Structures are given as C-alpha cells and as structure tokens.
Amino acid sequence: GVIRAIVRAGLAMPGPPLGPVLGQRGVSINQFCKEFNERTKDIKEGIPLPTKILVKPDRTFEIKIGQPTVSYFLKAAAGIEKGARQTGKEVAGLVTLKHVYEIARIKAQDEAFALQDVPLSSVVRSIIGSARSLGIRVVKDLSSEELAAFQKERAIFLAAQKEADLAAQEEAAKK
Amino acid sequence: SPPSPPQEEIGLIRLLRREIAAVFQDNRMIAVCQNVALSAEDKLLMRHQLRKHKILMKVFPNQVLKPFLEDSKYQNLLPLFVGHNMLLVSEEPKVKEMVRILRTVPFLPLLGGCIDDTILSRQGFINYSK
Amino acid sequence: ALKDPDVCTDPVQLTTYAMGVNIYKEGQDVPLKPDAEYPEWLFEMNLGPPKTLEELDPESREYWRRLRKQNIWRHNRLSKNK
Amino acid sequence: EALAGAPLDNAPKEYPPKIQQLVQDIASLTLLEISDLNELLKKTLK
Amino acid sequence: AAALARLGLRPVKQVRVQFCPFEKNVESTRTFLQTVSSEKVRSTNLNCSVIADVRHDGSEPCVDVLFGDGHRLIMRGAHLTALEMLTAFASHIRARDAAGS
Amino acid sequence: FREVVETQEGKTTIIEGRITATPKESPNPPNPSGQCPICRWNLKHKYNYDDVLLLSQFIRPHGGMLPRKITGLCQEEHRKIEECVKMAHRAGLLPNHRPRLPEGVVPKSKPQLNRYLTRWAPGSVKPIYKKGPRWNRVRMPVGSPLLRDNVCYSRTPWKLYH
Amino acid sequence: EDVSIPEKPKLRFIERAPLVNLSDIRGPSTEATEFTEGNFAILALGGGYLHWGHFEMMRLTINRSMDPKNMFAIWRVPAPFKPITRIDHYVTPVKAGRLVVEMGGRCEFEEVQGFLDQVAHKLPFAAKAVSRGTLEKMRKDQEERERNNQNPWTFERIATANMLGIRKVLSPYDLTHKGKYWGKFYMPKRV
RNA sequence: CCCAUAGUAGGCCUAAAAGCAGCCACCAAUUAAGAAAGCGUUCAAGCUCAACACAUCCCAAACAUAUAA
C-alpha cells in the first residue's frame, strides 16, 4: 500500500502519530527519521510537508516529498500565526493577489499539479478557495496602514477569543 | 404510441462537441487506445511520462464523439471507437516517444492513430515512428 | 505534536516579504515585483462567493460542473434516511 | 469531402490521386525545362 | 472482472487477443480483453502475461490462450459474445486447475 | 441463430459460433399496427395454456422462457405466456422441450399424476388439512388469474378457485 | 434557500389537560383541509380521538427525525379538550380528510415521507403522508373516477331519491356522505 | 452495472475527529468524482453509493372453456 502523512520538515519522530503507523506495516522506524531529516535538511525545521511512503509487500519503503501545504504559505504570507476560528464573519489575514500567485508558482512544481496538468490560471483559482477557508481576505491593493490596524485588532480579538478558550479550558479541567 | 418531441440537447453535450472541434485544430495528431483496465497508480505515471514528453491523456464519452465523426470528415474513425476509449493528443508529433511507452504495457493496445489528418493503423503508425 | 515557528508581524515586511513563500533556511522571502509584470488574469481572479447557475454561462464547463455538484447534493439529501 | 480509408498493412501502398498525376507530367517536360524549375525550388528551401 | 478476479489466472501462462479494431465484429473480443486485462484479474498472477496485439489485415478476431498442462484454447470473437467466451474460458481453466492439483 | 461449438483436435480446442437462418415471420400480419406479436396477429385474450403451437415459439429448446427484449412481447403478454408455458409443462404438453438426458442419468418411471391448469409447482403446495367454515373456506386455485381477461364463450366466467 | 425556518423549528409541547360526542369523529372534515405554509402533511383518512399519549409519540419521533435547519413542523391539531370518563383522560377528535400534522421547509416528499409515514402508522386511525402535488392528484384522481364512472347507479342518486325505500336501512347523514363514509371509517374507493 | 485520482488530513476545535464526536465551511484539479449519502475507525484506514466511462374428527360431493335464460 501507500501512506501519505504530513510531517514537519526535519521533525520526524519515532513516537506517535506517524510512529504506530509504521509499526503496523513493519517497516523500520528509525530509518525513516534518519533519511527524512537528512533529506529535508535545507528546508526550515518545522515546515508542514506532505510525505508519501511507497511501501512494498516486502516492507521496502521509498519515501516521497512534496511542497508544503497551502495553509502554511497563506498563513505566514499575511503574518497571521493561526487561522480564524470562524469563516465569513471575521477576516483572518490580508494578502495581495500577488501573494496568492507567488504561492501558486512554487506550488505548481509539486507532484499533484504534474498529474493535474492544469494551466497557470487554475493554480491561483485553487489557492483563493483555501484562503477563504482560512478567513484570509484577498484585496487588490492592501496598504500597510490598513494592514497594521486590521492585524492589531485581530491579534487583540484573537487574545480575547483565547481568553474565552482559556476559560473553557478551566471548565474542562473542572469536568 | 404518440411520437415524443425531440429531446433538447444538454449544454454539456454541446460543450463536449465544442471541445472536439478544438482537439484536431489544437493537436495535429490524436491517437485512440482502448484498455482502461490499467491501475490508477500506473495510469498516473503514464500521464506523468506523457507530460514529460508533452503528451496529454484524456477520456471523452463516445456518445457525443460518434455523431461528430459521422459528420466530420473522419467518418472512418468511427468504427475504432467501442466500449471504453481514451485519446492521446500532442501538437508536435512525438510518435516515437508515445510508442516506446505503450510497448511497456502489453495489455494496452493502440487501436489506431489519426496523425497528419490521416487515419493510420497501428502497424502503419510504427513505420511512421521510424 | 506539530510545532510551527512564530511569525514576525511587521506590516511593511509582511507585504514585501512573506515568510511562507520562503521554505528553505538558506533562501529569503520573495519580494513582490511591480504590478505590471504580474499577469493580468491574476487581477481578474474571482474573489466573490461561488457563483450561482444563473450567473454562470449555460454553455460553460464550470456551469455544468456546478450543476453536477448540486445534483449530487440533492441525492445526498434524499439518501440521508439511509 | 471525406477522408479516404486506411489501406490494409498487407495491401500494397496506395498513393493519392494528385501525387500520381504529378508523376506523369514530369516525364513529359524536357530536362532543360526541368533544370530551370529545379533552380527555383532550391532557393525556396534555403 | 469481479467474477474472474475471484478465480485468478493461476494455472495460465499467457494469452493472445488478436483483433483488427477497424472490423465491426471485434466488439466482443475487445470486451473480453478488458476483463482479462483487468488489474484485479491479472495482478493475481504477476508471472502470467497476456498478448493483445493489433493488426489491419482484415483477419477475423481470435483469442488464443496458453497454459501449462492444459492444452491451448482458441476462441473466435466474430461469432462469440464476451460473456460466453469468459464463462467458457473460466470453465476450461478451472478443469485444468483441478488436473494440476 | 448462433450455435457455439467446440472441437478438440491436434491438442488444441477451437470455440466458434455458427450463424444459421431462422424462421422468418409469416408475411403480412393481419394488424401491422400492433406493437407486439400477439396484438399484431389479433391473438390477445385468444390463447390458452394448451395452445402449444403459439407458446412453443417463445420458449427455448430446453423449455426456458425467452427474454422480452428478444421476443418483443409486451410485459402483460410476456407474463401471460410465461404462466401458460408453466402450466403447459406441468400438463405434459411439451415433452420435447426438456433438458437433454446425459449418459449418467438412468431411465426411471415414477408416479405420473396427470394434471392440468396447475398454477403452482406441485412440490411447493401444501395439503388443505382444515377447509374452514363456509364463509371462510380455503379454496384450491385452478388456472391463473392472468388469463381472467381471456375471451369467454360461456355465460359463466372461469372459476379460478375450486 | 428562499424558505425561512421559524425561530422554533421542532414541534412544541402539547399540554396533557386543558388549562380551562360520537358525531365528532364521523363524516368529512370541514377544517384544516388545505396546506398552510407547508408543502407536506399527514392526511387523516379515518376518524379517531387522539389522547395526549399520541401527541408525545408524534412530537418525539418527528422532532428527532427532522433536521431543524432543513425543515419545520407546525401543529394543526388543538389541545385535548374532550372529556373521557372511565375525567380519566382527554382526547382530540379528528375527522376524516383532515391534516393532522404539516411539514414545510427545504425538503422533498421522499425525504419527508419516511418519518411522516412512520408516525402515521402509529395514529389510532388510518393516515397517509401527503404533499401538495400528491394530495391534489388524490383529489383530482377522485373527481376523474366520478365523471368517468360507467355504473349508471350511484349511492347518491339512490339515496336522495329514496329508490327501493333504501332510506329505511340508511342513516340521515348518508345523504350528505353519499356512501363514502361509513361511521368513523372512510372508504376512498367509493364513488 | 461500473468504478471512485485528489488538493488536504479544509479551517477551528478535538488527547484523538483525516468525507465522517462536533463547530464552521461546503471551496476546488481533472472529462469526471458529495468537504460526503451511508456503513465503518482510539483517530486513521477499510467497505458501498452518488460521479466518469460503459382443546372428540377436515367437512356436501364436485367443476375453470357450448351462445342466460
């Protein structure tokens, strides 16, 4: 069979979650982290990287690496550290169309697009749909001044929502 | 029984016909294959290799193609299409590149190839590759 | 559990320099070139909510893909019983 | 207005009507006339 | 494909599916090719293979199967339905499988 | 009519079909407007279980029914003929439309209970041990309800339950 | 999407007793025969009293099966008012042809029929889930049977003219019912 | 009947929720394939579907086919 689990670049761990998955297959665990960490060395440690594992019945494994998820690109592209809790009602981040295009450029080099063999226009048409899921609104001409006020209010609002979440965590501990 | 009024053509049916009117225009050579039994993972690699060779693999329903062929100049193309069918298109004639990949899959047969606006059988297609 | 490095938040830097665009440690955030260089269609991309069938041209691939998705949704609702 | 049928692999090669007609005309023309014609054709290639 | 996939091409060695696609009467043979060429049916025995050649000589479509202990079986698609070829073929290999073991 | 054959010769077996001429329909049907063969010949409601000449045309050589698509019969007549063929078989009217007996089987003689208009297979039916009261009497079906619309040449309609 | 769900989609609770007559369940219903702000409903084909026990059963089943956002349900039956002495219990009489419950919202009859039909079989009287199109076809089909009836003799003609002195063996109410209604039971096939 | 590639394991939460405890969304690549209609998972995976291409002892006897009187 084939296993495709996202793994942070260079942070592969023998323990769960990917750990027990390998144990059932019977493939060596340490070897994966060894080869993977040494293959994603250049990539920043902590980048969400979808990884596909080609597992033969003999248990021989050939690892496969792809480009990072779109979430990671969009998130940082706006400066936002965490997407919005609610979509359509609040705007997580503000990124230009350029940012969506730049992600599309480097994201069209992955294995999925080669198989999908679509043109450049479709590449962006698929990243604008993900940004909305995050809450990140795209604006033709966003301005630093607008960005500063919008992000500051969101960060404070996120802290307010975090405070509400923290209160719920206390209730969860009680129960 | 009272004859029914002719059913209106669905917009999708028109869209499929519109696509056909561009295939031959865009890509000079179109090749017909029949074996769709190949597994998805092997199929994915087959398209990926075709892209490496600037060739595109696409499947269209013969339901719409068959009327078009009777109207189009390539009437003799119609008999080839039966059951499951697929199409290989490439504006540049990468005949040798296609043939060598098909040889790797014995159970996949090339029924015929329409190249240079000419219906050529598989046997004649090989000679063209040389 | 997955850990993500904190993102520095400076409004000018974020627009000019997106951290996400750069994935390698050696590399640096990709700057934005003048707008004219960027493709025009990029500026024409749809940012609004999904268009309804009436908005979409009837003889368009997207229109019937949307129509197909809606029809599958209708089957889904009926199948909810079992 | 309709494309011709593909010849059988065993069947001898079939040539378009236009090609066959052209062959007959070349034989009738004189070599001196052919020589003048040949010169113009070479220039078009390069 | 499902039916045969349950049986599997264990005692077979090779297959032959010669047909001229231009000929009208090749529909049954091509349908037969689909089933035998099915990954589920074939995967069962990676060692076993299949020939689906293609020509344009006008010969009537023919299917020839190669086995081991069992004798070769030849079926002409022109006057055979795909189901009858498959079911008759499956019966033949089943008997050959019993003879082998 | 396509007869598949198989010939084992020279350590090889060849399977091939043979196309043979079939019985052509009689020319000039009385009612060419009819959609199916029964109405095309003004035979609707005019055939019974014992009309083997009419029913034999829609059954296979081994007594099986032919598909509706092949015959062209309408669903209503297809079910009528299907029931009539069942009763015709159970009555012994079709003694040559049975499966061929191979070498293995032995000729045997068993109780031959003459019967006709048998709606149900003899084995499935169970004896009526308790008839019940007059107002709720358990009756014995005779014939089929599908043939209830057949032409009646008597002042009394067919009794389907005895 | 055009349809709007009320702030309270699920069916409301029904009081066991009012806060504060066999003819009641006999004959055609004169009220609640037409859909009001709801395409689907449960059509009563018989006459029977409904105690609170039934109301709780219907409310529990309908509410859980229905999706609040997709569809809404409105009660058409009033609260139990009739006193039954064995007051031992209170009941609500329903005449034939009355819509006991109505279902309206973003749904289809096939989606709605499932739970509505299931609840219908529990009702003490014959009931069938109906829709605007279905119910109209039901009434339109009934009218077609009357106009195209080949029988030259009808219950109404015989009863109204008192032919054969039939009124000696008939009820006075049969003149209006015309033989379609026999006591609480209603016979749809009767023309 | 056929067969179901995949962004990605959507976001948010969830120890865990990968179509599928929930919440919010329900956008998208492909000619096509529901952020999913079931089943199934600790979560995954797996399996289908919608898509593409194709209470002594029964109780008259009987009877279907001769122009209703």
Ligand code: FES
């Ligand atoms: S359609 Fe006339 S008898 Fe079958």
